[PDB]
Design a protein around this ligand. Structure first.
Ligand SMILES: [Ca+2]
Length: 119
């Protein structure tokens, strides 16, 4: 769920407030369309597409599904007790969190005008 994803981000990118990734580019946060503006945005595009794919699973609601995971000593792990939905969503979140840690963060790309720039 989003609370868990927030925690994944806190654990792979502790140097930033989680909310720095909640409204960035065309894909990080509410936005889900247009040109990814940079590599961080591309991380979010993949994440968004990953969620859309997980939503094909019956009863699978990525913002809400509580999965089983651990973040310890620099590593994120999706646990074995996860059902197909939980495993898929956890993997989406894990890969995105790792992606965020390796992407440059451009302040100019925070809170962009989605209606104008993400068609
Ligand atoms: Ca999004």
């Amino acid at each position: 769920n989003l609370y868990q994803f927030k925690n994944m981000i806190q654990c792979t990118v502790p140097s930033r407030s989680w909310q720095d990734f909640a409204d960035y580019g065309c894909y990080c946060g509410k936005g889900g369309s247009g040109t990814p503006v940079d590599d961080l945005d591309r991380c979010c595009q993949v994440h968004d597409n990953c969620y859309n794919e997980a939503e094909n699973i019956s009863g699978c609601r990525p913002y809400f599904k509580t999965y089983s995971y651990e973040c310890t000593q620099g590593t994120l792990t999706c646990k074995g007790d996860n059902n197909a939905c939980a495993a898929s969503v956890c993997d989406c979140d894990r890969l995105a969190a790792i992606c965020f840690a390796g992407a440059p963060y451009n302040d100019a790309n925070y809170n962009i005008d989605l209606k104008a720039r993400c068609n």
